[PDB]
Protein backbone atom coordinates (compact mmCIF):
# COMPACT_ATOMS: atom_id res chain seq x y z
CA UNK A 1 0.00 0.00 0.00
CA UNK A 2 2.88 2.37 0.81
CA UNK A 3 4.62 1.52 -2.47
CA UNK A 4 1.34 2.10 -4.31
CA UNK A 5 1.15 5.48 -2.58
CA UNK A 6 4.78 6.17 -3.57
CA UNK A 7 4.35 6.25 -7.35
CA UNK A 8 2.25 8.03 -9.96
CA UNK A 9 2.61 5.65 -12.91
CA UNK A 10 -0.27 3.27 -13.60
CA UNK A 11 2.19 0.44 -14.29
CA UNK A 12 5.83 -0.15 -13.41
CA UNK A 13 6.91 -1.26 -16.86
CA UNK A 14 10.51 -2.12 -17.70
CA UNK A 15 12.56 -3.09 -20.74
CA UNK A 16 12.03 -6.82 -20.17
CA UNK A 17 8.26 -6.33 -19.87
CA UNK A 18 8.00 -5.00 -23.44
CA UNK A 19 11.01 -6.58 -25.16
CA UNK A 20 10.75 -5.36 -28.76
CA UNK A 21 8.66 -2.19 -28.73
CA UNK A 22 11.34 -0.16 -30.54
CA UNK A 23 11.55 -2.16 -33.77
CA UNK A 24 7.77 -2.58 -34.04
CA UNK A 25 7.13 1.14 -33.48
CA UNK A 26 9.89 2.10 -35.94
CA UNK A 27 8.60 -0.19 -38.70
CA UNK A 28 5.01 0.92 -38.20
CA UNK A 29 6.15 4.55 -38.33
CA UNK A 30 7.88 3.83 -41.64
CA UNK A 31 4.68 2.17 -42.89
CA UNK A 32 2.76 5.23 -41.67
CA UNK A 33 5.02 7.48 -43.73
CA UNK A 34 4.30 5.18 -46.68
CA UNK A 35 0.69 6.23 -46.12
CA UNK A 36 -0.54 9.82 -46.00
CA UNK A 37 -0.40 10.08 -42.20
CA UNK A 38 2.77 11.94 -41.19
CA UNK A 39 1.45 13.19 -37.84
CA UNK A 40 0.73 9.71 -36.47
CA UNK A 41 4.29 8.51 -37.03
CA UNK A 42 5.51 11.52 -35.03
CA UNK A 43 3.04 10.61 -32.26
CA UNK A 44 4.12 6.97 -32.11
CA UNK A 45 7.84 7.84 -32.27
CA UNK A 46 7.29 10.37 -29.49
CA UNK A 47 5.72 7.66 -27.32
CA UNK A 48 8.66 5.34 -28.09
CA UNK A 49 11.30 7.97 -27.33
CA UNK A 50 9.49 9.09 -24.17
CA UNK A 51 9.68 5.56 -22.78
CA UNK A 52 13.27 5.21 -24.01
CA UNK A 53 14.32 8.38 -22.21
CA UNK A 54 12.31 7.21 -19.19
CA UNK A 55 14.24 4.00 -18.60
CA UNK A 56 17.60 5.56 -19.53
CA UNK A 57 20.77 13.82 -34.65
CA UNK A 58 19.31 15.00 -37.97
CA UNK A 59 16.80 17.31 -36.25
CA UNK A 60 19.53 19.54 -34.79
CA UNK A 61 22.45 21.54 -36.13
CA UNK A 62 20.81 24.98 -36.40
CA UNK A 63 20.51 27.35 -33.44
CA UNK A 64 19.38 30.97 -33.28
CA UNK A 65 21.68 33.65 -31.85
CA UNK A 66 20.57 37.10 -30.72
CA UNK A 67 22.48 40.12 -31.99
CA UNK A 68 24.50 41.46 -29.07
CA UNK A 69 24.26 45.24 -28.65
CA UNK A 70 25.25 47.41 -25.69
CA UNK A 71 21.94 49.02 -24.71
CA UNK A 72 20.82 50.62 -21.46
CA UNK A 73 17.12 51.45 -21.45
CA UNK A 74 13.92 50.62 -23.32
CA UNK A 75 15.71 49.33 -26.41
CA UNK A 76 17.44 46.51 -24.52
CA UNK A 77 14.00 45.17 -23.63
CA UNK A 78 12.60 45.97 -27.09
CA UNK A 79 15.48 44.32 -28.95
CA UNK A 80 14.02 40.86 -28.25
CA UNK A 81 10.37 41.77 -28.87
CA UNK A 82 7.96 40.90 -31.67
CA UNK A 83 7.53 43.48 -34.41
CA UNK A 84 3.76 43.07 -34.85
CA UNK A 85 2.27 42.64 -31.35
CA UNK A 86 5.23 44.25 -29.49
CA UNK A 87 5.54 41.44 -26.94
CA UNK A 88 8.48 39.27 -25.93
CA UNK A 89 9.30 36.34 -28.22
CA UNK A 90 10.45 33.17 -26.50
CA UNK A 91 8.67 30.31 -28.32
CA UNK A 92 7.63 29.54 -31.92
CA UNK A 93 9.36 32.42 -33.69
CA UNK A 94 9.89 33.46 -37.32
CA UNK A 95 13.18 34.95 -38.51
CA UNK A 96 13.81 36.78 -41.78
CA UNK A 97 17.23 36.90 -43.40
CA UNK A 98 17.36 40.15 -45.36
CA UNK A 99 16.23 42.08 -42.29
CA UNK A 100 16.86 40.42 -38.95
CA UNK A 101 13.47 40.92 -37.32
CA UNK A 102 11.50 38.38 -35.30
CA UNK A 103 7.79 37.54 -35.41
CA UNK A 104 5.48 35.18 -33.56
CA UNK A 105 3.86 32.24 -35.31
CA UNK A 106 0.32 33.58 -34.85
CA UNK A 107 1.54 37.13 -35.56
CA UNK A 108 3.12 36.06 -38.86
CA UNK A 109 0.14 33.93 -39.90
CA UNK A 110 -2.11 36.93 -39.19
CA UNK A 111 0.08 39.62 -40.74
CA UNK A 112 1.06 37.97 -44.02
CA UNK A 113 -2.57 37.63 -45.10
CA UNK A 114 -2.93 41.43 -45.01
CA UNK A 115 0.68 42.49 -45.49
CA UNK A 116 3.46 42.85 -48.02
CA UNK A 117 6.36 44.46 -46.14
CA UNK A 118 8.05 44.06 -42.78
CA UNK A 119 5.81 45.27 -39.91
CA UNK A 120 8.75 47.20 -38.44
CA UNK A 121 8.84 49.26 -41.64
CA UNK A 122 12.45 48.70 -42.68
CA UNK A 123 11.53 48.34 -46.35
CA UNK A 124 12.17 44.61 -46.74
CA UNK A 125 9.72 42.47 -48.72
CA UNK A 126 9.95 39.56 -46.29
CA UNK A 127 7.74 37.12 -48.32
CA UNK A 128 10.37 37.26 -51.08
CA UNK A 129 13.53 37.92 -49.07
CA UNK A 130 13.63 35.80 -45.90
CA UNK A 131 16.15 33.47 -47.58
Amino acid sequence: IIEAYEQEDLLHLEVSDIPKFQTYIYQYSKLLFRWGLPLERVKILKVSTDFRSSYSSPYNGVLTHWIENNEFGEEKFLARNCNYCDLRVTRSSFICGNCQHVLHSSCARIWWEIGDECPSGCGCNCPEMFD
Binding site: K46, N60, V62, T64, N69, R91, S93, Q100, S105, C122
Partner: protein, 150 residues
Protein backbone atom coordinates in the same frame (compact mmCIF):
# COMPACT_ATOMS: atom_id res chain seq x y z
CA UNK B 1 -7.05 64.93 -31.90
CA UNK B 2 -3.58 63.45 -32.22
CA UNK B 3 -4.72 60.88 -34.82
CA UNK B 4 -5.19 63.33 -37.69
CA UNK B 5 -2.09 65.28 -36.65
CA UNK B 6 0.05 62.14 -36.86
CA UNK B 7 -1.55 60.82 -40.06
CA UNK B 8 -1.06 64.21 -41.74
CA UNK B 9 2.42 65.06 -40.43
CA UNK B 10 3.81 61.70 -41.59
CA UNK B 11 3.54 62.95 -45.19
CA UNK B 12 6.32 65.52 -44.93
CA UNK B 13 8.20 65.45 -41.63
CA UNK B 14 10.87 62.68 -41.88
CA UNK B 15 11.27 63.58 -45.56
CA UNK B 16 11.90 67.30 -45.11
CA UNK B 17 12.11 68.66 -41.54
CA UNK B 18 13.00 67.03 -38.23
CA UNK B 19 10.71 68.26 -35.44
CA UNK B 20 9.88 66.72 -32.08
CA UNK B 21 6.15 67.50 -32.22
CA UNK B 22 5.63 65.08 -35.11
CA UNK B 23 7.61 62.44 -33.21
CA UNK B 24 5.41 62.99 -30.14
CA UNK B 25 2.23 62.67 -32.22
CA UNK B 26 3.51 59.51 -33.94
CA UNK B 27 4.50 57.89 -30.63
CA UNK B 28 1.18 58.86 -29.02
CA UNK B 29 -0.85 57.45 -31.90
CA UNK B 30 1.18 54.22 -31.96
CA UNK B 31 0.78 53.76 -28.19
CA UNK B 32 -2.95 54.40 -28.56
CA UNK B 33 -3.13 51.80 -31.34
CA UNK B 34 -1.32 49.31 -29.10
CA UNK B 35 -3.73 50.12 -26.26
CA UNK B 36 -6.69 49.52 -28.57
CA UNK B 37 -5.10 46.20 -29.68
CA UNK B 38 -5.06 47.46 -33.27
CA UNK B 39 -1.83 45.73 -34.25
CA UNK B 40 -2.82 45.48 -37.92
CA UNK B 41 -3.44 49.23 -38.02
CA UNK B 42 -0.14 49.88 -36.21
CA UNK B 43 1.75 47.77 -38.76
CA UNK B 44 -0.04 49.53 -41.63
CA UNK B 45 0.86 52.89 -40.07
CA UNK B 46 4.50 51.84 -39.80
CA UNK B 47 4.76 50.61 -43.39
CA UNK B 48 2.98 53.78 -44.56
CA UNK B 49 5.54 55.89 -42.69
CA UNK B 50 8.31 53.89 -44.36
CA UNK B 51 6.67 54.35 -47.77
CA UNK B 52 6.26 58.11 -47.32
CA UNK B 53 9.69 58.56 -45.70
CA UNK B 54 11.56 57.98 -48.96
CA UNK B 55 13.07 61.14 -50.43
CA UNK B 56 13.34 62.08 -54.11
CA UNK B 57 16.51 59.98 -54.35
CA UNK B 58 14.99 57.03 -52.46
CA UNK B 59 16.99 57.00 -49.20
CA UNK B 60 14.86 55.90 -46.25
CA UNK B 61 15.11 58.59 -43.57
CA UNK B 62 12.78 57.16 -40.91
CA UNK B 63 14.37 55.56 -37.86
CA UNK B 64 13.93 51.78 -37.86
CA UNK B 65 14.38 49.16 -35.16
CA UNK B 66 17.87 47.58 -35.15
CA UNK B 67 18.44 44.01 -36.25
CA UNK B 68 17.68 41.42 -33.59
CA UNK B 69 18.53 37.77 -34.30
CA UNK B 70 20.29 35.57 -36.84
CA UNK B 71 20.53 31.85 -37.51
CA UNK B 72 23.71 29.83 -36.98
CA UNK B 73 24.61 26.25 -37.96
CA UNK B 74 26.77 25.16 -34.96
CA UNK B 75 29.60 23.75 -37.15
CA UNK B 76 31.32 26.80 -38.65
CA UNK B 77 29.32 29.17 -36.37
CA UNK B 78 28.23 31.61 -39.08
CA UNK B 79 25.04 32.94 -40.62
CA UNK B 80 23.38 30.47 -42.98
CA UNK B 81 21.79 33.15 -45.19
CA UNK B 82 23.51 36.17 -46.72
CA UNK B 83 21.83 39.61 -46.25
CA UNK B 84 20.46 24.55 -51.71
CA UNK B 85 19.47 22.47 -48.64
CA UNK B 86 23.00 22.76 -47.22
CA UNK B 87 25.02 25.31 -45.31
CA UNK B 88 26.87 27.42 -47.92
CA UNK B 89 30.07 27.45 -45.82
CA UNK B 90 30.68 24.07 -44.17
CA UNK B 91 28.26 22.03 -46.29
CA UNK B 92 26.42 20.53 -43.32
CA UNK B 93 22.86 19.27 -43.62
CA UNK B 94 20.07 21.52 -42.39
CA UNK B 95 17.53 19.95 -40.02
CA UNK B 96 14.30 18.83 -41.62
CA UNK B 97 10.69 19.38 -40.72
CA UNK B 98 9.63 16.66 -38.30
CA UNK B 99 6.38 16.08 -40.20
CA UNK B 100 7.49 15.71 -43.83
CA UNK B 101 11.31 15.30 -43.55
CA UNK B 102 12.11 18.14 -45.96
CA UNK B 103 15.20 20.25 -45.18
CA UNK B 104 15.55 24.01 -44.88
CA UNK B 105 16.11 25.98 -48.07
CA UNK B 106 18.55 28.90 -48.25
CA UNK B 107 20.37 30.80 -50.98
CA UNK B 108 1.75 37.19 -49.74
CA UNK B 109 3.86 34.59 -47.94
CA UNK B 110 2.52 31.05 -47.96
CA UNK B 111 2.37 28.86 -44.86
CA UNK B 112 4.67 26.24 -46.41
CA UNK B 113 7.80 28.29 -47.08
CA UNK B 114 9.31 29.54 -43.81
CA UNK B 115 10.43 27.53 -40.82
CA UNK B 116 9.15 28.33 -37.33
CA UNK B 117 12.34 28.12 -35.26
CA UNK B 118 11.31 28.11 -31.61
CA UNK B 119 13.92 29.93 -29.53
CA UNK B 120 13.56 27.58 -26.55
CA UNK B 121 14.09 24.11 -28.04
CA UNK B 122 15.64 25.19 -31.40
CA UNK B 123 13.57 22.68 -33.39
CA UNK B 124 12.19 23.85 -36.72
CA UNK B 125 9.09 22.85 -38.65
CA UNK B 126 7.41 24.43 -41.64
CA UNK B 127 4.64 26.90 -40.84
CA UNK B 128 1.70 24.79 -42.02
CA UNK B 129 3.13 21.56 -40.61
CA UNK B 130 3.77 23.25 -37.25
CA UNK B 131 0.27 24.75 -37.18
CA UNK B 132 -1.29 21.37 -37.99
CA UNK B 133 0.85 19.57 -35.38
CA UNK B 134 0.22 22.14 -32.63
CA UNK B 135 -3.49 22.41 -33.43
CA UNK B 136 -4.02 19.06 -31.68
CA UNK B 137 -0.89 18.77 -29.49
CA UNK B 138 1.23 20.87 -27.17
CA UNK B 139 4.63 19.17 -27.42
CA UNK B 140 7.65 19.64 -29.67
CA UNK B 141 7.78 16.86 -32.28
CA UNK B 142 11.52 16.17 -32.14
CA UNK B 143 12.62 13.37 -29.78
CA UNK B 144 14.23 14.33 -26.51
CA UNK B 145 12.50 17.68 -26.03
CA UNK B 146 9.85 19.01 -23.64
CA UNK B 147 8.75 22.45 -24.83
CA UNK B 148 5.19 23.68 -25.41
CA UNK B 149 5.92 25.98 -28.34
CA UNK B 150 2.33 26.79 -29.29
Amino acid sequence: DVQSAALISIFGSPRYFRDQRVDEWIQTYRDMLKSWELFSMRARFDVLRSKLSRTKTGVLTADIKPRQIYIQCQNCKQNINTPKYCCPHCGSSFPRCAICLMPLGTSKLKLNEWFSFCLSCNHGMHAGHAEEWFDRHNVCPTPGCTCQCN
